[PDB]
From a paper:
To define the binding mode of O2 with respect to L-Trp and to obtain direct molecular insight into the catalytic mechanism, we prepared crystals of ferrous hTDO in complex with L-Trp under anaerobic conditions and then exposed them to an O2-saturated solution at room temperature. In contrast, no electron density for O2 was observed in crystals mounted directly in the glove box, and the structure of hTDO in this binary complex with L-Trp is mostly the same as that obtained following O2 exposure. The recognition of the L-Trp substrate by hTDO is similar to that by XcTDO, as most of the residues in the active site region of the two enzymes are conserved. His76 is hydrogen-bonded to the N1 atom of L-Trp, although this interaction is not essential for [name] catalysis and this residue is replaced by Ser in IDO. The structure revealed that a second L-Trp molecule is bound to each hTDO subunit, with well-defined electron density. This exo site is located at the other end of the four-helical bundle and is ~42 Å from the active site. The side chain of this L-Trp is sandwiched between Trp208 (helix αH) and Pro213, and is in direct contact with several other hydrophobic residues. The main-chain carboxylate group has bidentate ion-pair interactions with the side chain of Arg211 (αH).
Numbering used by the authors:
A (entry chain D): 39 to 243, 248 to 391
B (entry chain C): 39 to 168, 180 to 237, 257 to 391
C (entry chain A): 39 to 244, 251 to 381
D (entry chain B): 39 to 170, 180 to 381
The structure:
């Protein structure tokens, strides 16, 4: 007969708390809070990876093509986002430890650090952090912190398809992009040209000289969206992550989100942004706690400490930057290519 | 030397997830979340036990008498509050599991249930909640001892009885208080008068104690009111924070029970639980003041009077209640 | 050009703070907190009403029929829940006021109370709380607080279609229920009857299980008892029509089918809102207990004891959505498509 | 008789919502959310100002000297951080507005913006955000803003109180003189240990780390270095207020120091939460605008990112004192 403790394997979970300060002569009371906190984070990291891998598989094995699977995909991605909120507020518990009491056992931690968290790196990689985009500390690649089987695992996570790459391929298949079909991009380029011209004609008919200047730059940006060569250049700089065609699909889903087939997909894209946003907030809440804990002391793990972490709060680690930056090309509602009754029907369940 | 995963014994923590649906033929994806969620709770239960026992020990070994320890005491108790708030919020994660998906692996859980959580019971007992069939062997022992050892309620109680100002040949708070309330009432209804004076009925209080309506002794109650009214006095400041934290822990506990109820409702409807209870209904009954260990601290708000009525503290007792 | 303060009408919002303790002689510092806190609850009440009326309108005027609008409906209802979530937590700001400090200005408040909040009642009604659902004290006093224009709005909020009623009509049109078509209810009764029979066979092949089985057979088959449904629909155990219940269950079982994906989100949101309204009632209670103890309320209720009575399923407008969990069956039994 | 709606002045509060999009024809449903959200923020800003001024007065009028008042001071300061935490969470509400729906009424907002929030500026100044923006303000509002720059800030008031911390006096406990003495000996003893070790790469690694540590620790006792950093703005507290804060950190368990230590912790909490407000703000603004310039004239997203830095952290020094934490046995005995 199943027993709660055995089902949950608490004989392992609740016998995993060894205070290094205890195993060295003077246990420091607050080291217990320190271990439990990290262990709770790591248990949730594992859950995130579980969801994340299942969603990667759904894309990879072709099942995302069958649109009855979108509810499951969006519901699991949103769950990753919900766990991450919890992880962001979880720092409030560690923050009840003063820096003085932390100071009483910090000496027993060296040279271990969060640099040695296998799962945090797995998670970064599987979402789609580019290894060359990573802020360096001590002049070498992050994987130097791992050896053997763990190193092997990390390498596979750098090599296997990332959430970013999977979502990208799917985005490239978004209905409506086909030039000989609805031809979204063609119609969009045309409609933006018209809009601008009607807008310029309206303007030229202090405010004027300014509105002209304001017009002139909005025009450059909007029209630059159709410069594919410019995009390719920004791709290789890692300034952009998505392929030109994938950007098109994403924009297609933004504009026509209310169309029934695009409603859950638009929720997914929103979730992808949520997850980028939560991950960075995790980083920043981390940074704020570490400032109070260390001041400007160097880290047990070999970094500058507070200062290094601060530099990781940046778009370098924002995998779906392209989804955020699409808001740059938002246009007036009536500029958006109208849908005929055939494609309106194409995009119905 | 030391490595992250070894340090945290991730070898154990991250190798502790066995889907009962998987070992039984058809693995259900959402059972992983079900397992991880309970494991995170238990970890935090263990942390709470760790803080709680450490605070009980400070009361027990006499260190609480040394008032330089109050900061340690309040801060650890506040920490318990903070952890509990996260635990209340943590239900929102499990709530991303639809009842339908839950329904796909629930069959593999019987007869197990939360009734078998050792740490939850240890928690309730050590705080002062006044089922053990669900345990036996060595676990029944710890459970036994947690009922027999002095509770947080009893330890706070004794400490509350030693509160300065409560001695009849000293500042005589209680005598002075009955005088000022007898005066102020007749200076000024019958219903408030009835209630306010019943505070001075020690006999009524003892009767309510045995009835279980009240937990703290009469004397301990007096110290608590003394700390409320004079909380700004330096020696009472951190003690007042402590009383506040005790009340915090009480609310968060039932808020835990209640968020639990709301989720279980959506998961089970009116089905009976795997542990043999009526389920939702049974859980609804635990969200009551029967489980509120520090009810008296809440109830004291009944007897709050105008500032004027409060026994003026002369310069003698003022300098005494200075650090 | 417009300016922030003017745009937001801050000349109204930030000039709305009058400390009654200050008006009557002695300013008590924490009354400001007290005031701002309610004002913020009411701004959000207004917002909730705004989302809510607009979703009601989408149902009422037929727009929901075009499923293009389902993203809007679910986004706004989920928005209502996100706001309620914030409002549950907002109590922690007022909890930084000790009971002893509150007691220094409580006297200047009587006989006014939260009981006189028009928007809270509007919200209750527009979601769908019926007069019968209300606690006896509340039923004969909630409307006896307002007059004229406010009383006008209250009557409307009850006379007009509720979210409950509107969602009920729409659930009744759930594709799949039509007997000439997919005949969901017919297939379901057949499959469950077959399932129970296979199950009873398995248990006979092997004392507790037969007893468990029997209770479960009793409950499941009872689902198909429409008369029982109406009887319960009169003791107030149930609120939704029979057919609407079938639509809800249809959306649960077939939630992955694309036309049901967003509808399923909506039912979940509906339950979220119910939960969060009660968690609001309960956080409220927990606070008030520490503020009043056993003292009666300024509005004349018993205080703690009364408020605690509102933390009841009798106030859950969508109880049925919760209670359909009672009737969940193994995947295998669900009628195939 | 007093009535709820009247008490709260809801005739003002619930009649303050004017959708500009509506005023110009096409009502956009989400503009209402946008308005209510900002209005809620401003009510909470007002509450913060209220609490914050009350605490400033306690200091300014000398009431902090009477230590009866420390419970009030800390509880109100803690109250401020509890409000700020809600304000940070409050962004999640506005985040249920998509960028495309925001786009439908954004044009009606120009040229208003958060630059024109009076209360947010007052908040910054009163806490003590160093000057080195009033363009967006005029008239009486401009006046108030000046007054907030000239009146004593929370930072300045806490600084003065820290300068009066008991224990600092040289002919009394002489905390600083003793602290320097013990640090110097502590390091010299640590250095003896390292020297004893056998010549290795590890030993040199320990010597090298030691030297870096010794230099940092002992620079605590360089007052000229501190003054130089003050002038550069890289620091904010006087040298002596720093000694007081350190005194309170080290001896926090001493009864007279318990609640003051809570106070200092609360200050760091508020810095931490202000910057978390700015960053949550940033994250939302990126989804809303991408790289479009703000209606208020800034570059937008890029500008807001720059406000998320220690340039705005009023109590940096309280954070940076963790740089000088030492082993317990080096702390001067009482
Ligand atoms: C007192 C509390 C903490 C301190 C002082 C601290 C400090 C640091 C420091 C200084 C680093 C940079 C590496 C180094 O030089 O050591 C770091 C990295 C890291 N820490 Fe923390 N940390 C704390 C709490 C936590 C917690 C609770 C977690 C939960 C898993 C965590 C996870 C990580 C991770 C994943 C990294 C790598 C981050 C990256 O490179 O982006 N830390 N930490
Ligand atoms: C889908 C989620 C859950 C369901 C359906 C559920 C259901 C139940 C039920 C029906 C009971 C009463 C005993 C029984 O008949 O089995 C119970 C008890 C209990 N469960 Fe949960 N539960 C859930 C999640 C959790 C979680 C995540 C925890 C975290 C540790 C937890 C901890 C407890 C505790 C401590 C009790 C005993 C409570 C008391 O007696 O006051 N449960 N649960
Ligand atoms: C110190 C804080 C509070 C106390 C002591 C308190 C107390 C009470 C009491 C006693 C009642 C019952 C009516 C009566 O007899 O007066 C009540 C009802 C109510 N209050 Fe509060 N309250 C507090 C804060 C709030 C806040 C912040 C709100 C936010 C809007 C609020 C809104 C309401 C509402 C809507 C009702 C009617 C509830 C129902 O009928 O279910 N109250 N309150
Ligand atoms: C869709 C939502 C929002 C957007 C797109 C947005 C955008 C911006 C931008 C672009 C600026 C820089 C000035 C400019 O060029 O306009 C700014 C500043 C500011 N905003 Fe927001 N904002 C939003 C919501 C809010 C909310 C809810 C508040 C609450 C009061 C707020 C308060 C402020 C404040 C106080 C500033 C000045 C901050 C500083 O200069 O450090 N904003 N905002
Ligand atoms: N489901 C189809 C079509 C598709 C691709 N990307 C999409 C985005 C939104 C909606 C549909 C699609 C496929 O995967 O090939
Ligand atoms: N790197 C941290 C120490 C630390 C944080 N989390 C850890 C987990 C395990 C081991 C060490 C750590 C510091 O410099 O203070
Ligand atoms: N510390 C002393 C005095 C004391 C008892 N109870 C208190 C409550 C508040 C302040 C001081 C006390 C003791 O433990 O006996
Ligand atoms: N008692 C729960 C099952 C359950 C909840 N949490 C558990 C933890 C372990 C084992 C079983 C459970 C039910 O009736 O559905
Ligand atoms: N949208 C159609 C059909 C419908 C009713 N209820 C539904 C639930 C889910 C999907 C479609 C429907 C209508 O309103 O009449
Ligand atoms: N009913 C509350 C008083 C109260 C709570 N919230 C209010 C808002 C406005 C006016 C009065 C109130 C009591 O009995 O103490
Ligand atoms: N309260 C006294 C002494 C004092 C100043 N700073 C302190 C810090 C901690 C404890 C006491 C003090 C004063 O204001 O002058
Ligand atoms: N600054 C925002 C507009 C904005 C945000 N909050 C505001 C409050 C009032 C007026 C305008 C705003 C933008 O550039 O899009």
């Amino acid at each position: 007969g199943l027993i709660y403790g055995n089902y949950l394997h608490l004989e392992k979970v609740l016998n995993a708390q060894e205070l290094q300060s205890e195993t060295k002569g003077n246990k420091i009371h607050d080291e217990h809070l320190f271990i439990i906190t990290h262990q709770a984070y790591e248990l949730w990291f594992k859950q995130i990876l579980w969801e994340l891998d299942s969603v990667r598989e759904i894309f990879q094995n072709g099942h995302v093509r069958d649109e009855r699977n979108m509810l499951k995909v969006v519901s699991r991605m949103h769950r990753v986002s919900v766990i991450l909120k919890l992880l962001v507020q979880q720092f409030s518990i560690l923050e009840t430890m003063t820096a003085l009491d932390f100071n009483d056992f910090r000496e027993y931690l060296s040279p271990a650090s969060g640099f040695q968290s296998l799962q945090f790196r797995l998670l970064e990689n599987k979402i789609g952090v580019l290894q060359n985009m990573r802020v360096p500390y001590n002049r070498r690649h992050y994987r130097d912190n791992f050896k053997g089987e763990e190193n092997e695992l990390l390498l596979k996570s750098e090599q296997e398809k990332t959430l970013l790459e999977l979502v990208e391929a799917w985005l490239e298949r978004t209905p409506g992009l086909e030039p000989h079909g609805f031809n979204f991009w063609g119609k969009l380029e045309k409609n933006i040209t018209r809009g601008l011209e009607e807008e310029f004609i309206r303007i030229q008919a202090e405010e004027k000289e300014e509105q002209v200047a304001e017009f002139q730059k909005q025009k450059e940006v909007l029209l630059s969206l159709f410069d594919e060569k410019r995009h390719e250049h920004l791709l290789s700089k890692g300034e952009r992550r998505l392929s030109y065609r994938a950007l098109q699909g994403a924009l297609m889903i933004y504009f026509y989100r209310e169309e029934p087939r695009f409603q859950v997909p638009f929720q997914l894209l929103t979730s992808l942004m949520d997850i980028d946003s939560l991950m960075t907030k995790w980083r920043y809440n981390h940074v704020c706690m570490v400032h109070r804990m260390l001041g400007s002391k160097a880290g047990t793990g070999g970094s500058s400490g507070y200062h290094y972490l601060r530099s990781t709060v940046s778009d370098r680690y924002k995998v779906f930057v392209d989804l955020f930056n699409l808001s740059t090309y938002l246009i007036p509602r009536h500029w958006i290519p109208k849908m005929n009754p055939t494609i309106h029907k194409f995009l119905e369940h």
